[PDB]
Design a protein around this ligand. Structure first.
Ligand code: 1PZ
Length: 200
């Protein structure tokens, strides 16, 4: 019942698996881990419940994909063979949006850690969003998100919703930051090594 701990435990397993040469990452286990992140977006206010749904929709596709597909590589190789990589709703396309979700949380976590003593979430939330999603979300979406900033809870309140004190929240947020880093790099390299790009 400790959402940050579930997140930290799940991504630590992925970081371990992935710090192997030639890793075999199960879609099942990957999408499960990703869904553990979902509630964080809920904790960022009622406007951002919509950001949660947008994230949850992508993760849910990875979940359905995992019923008939073993690894993230196999998933991308299928889409590559059907030439449907960037088609709206393809597993690989959703995979890329989900990777950004993870990065989003990671940078948010960094920004929150680097802004201790500030009880407001506005600066960490806008900086992390500008960095991760500004190059990809259109003007329309970004305007909405910018409006969403006005419903942000306090820092202390967020922590209360995650049921952590300052010290514990810091350890589990830092853990996710540590674990998610090589995973994101691994996911980026999956797209780069197949010349798909990460910008679409
Ligand atoms: C007046 C009420 C206030 C409304 C304010 C609206 C709140 C912002 C809602 C943000 C949802 C935008 C998610 C973007 C959806 C799609 O454009 C993309 C591409 O999907 P595709 O075209 O392949 O179907 N979806 C994503 O990139 C999923 C990313 C989900 C996580 C991003 C939100 C995180 C924002 C954090 C802000 C603290």
């Amino acid at each position: 019942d400790k959402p940050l701990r579930k997140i930290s435990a799940a991504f630590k397993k992925l970081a371990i698996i992935v710090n192997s040469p030639n890793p075999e990452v199960p879609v099942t286990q990957f999408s499960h881990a990703c869904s553990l992140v979902s509630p964080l977006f809920g904790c960022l206010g009622i406007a951002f419940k919509f950001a949660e749904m947008a994230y949850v929709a992508k993760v849910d596709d990875l979940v359905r994909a995992s019923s008939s597909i073993s690894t993230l590589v196999v998933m991308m190789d299928k889409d590559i063979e059907a030439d449907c990589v960037r088609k709206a709703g393809s597993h690989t396309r959703n995979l890329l949006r989900v990777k950004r979700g993870l990065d989003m949380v990671k940078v948010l976590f960094e920004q929150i850690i680097a802004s201790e003593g500030d009880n407001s979430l506005k600066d960490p939330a806008t900086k992390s969003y500008a960095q991760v999603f500004a190059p990809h979300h259109g003007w329309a979406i970004r305007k909405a998100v910018s409006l969403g900033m006005y419903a942000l809870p306090t820092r202390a309140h967020l922590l209360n919703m995650l049921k952590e004190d300052e010290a514990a929240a810091k350890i589990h947020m830092q853990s996710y930051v540590n674990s998610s880093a090589p995973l994101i790099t691994y996911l980026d390299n999956l797209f780069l090594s197949k010349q798909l790009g990460i910008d679409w």
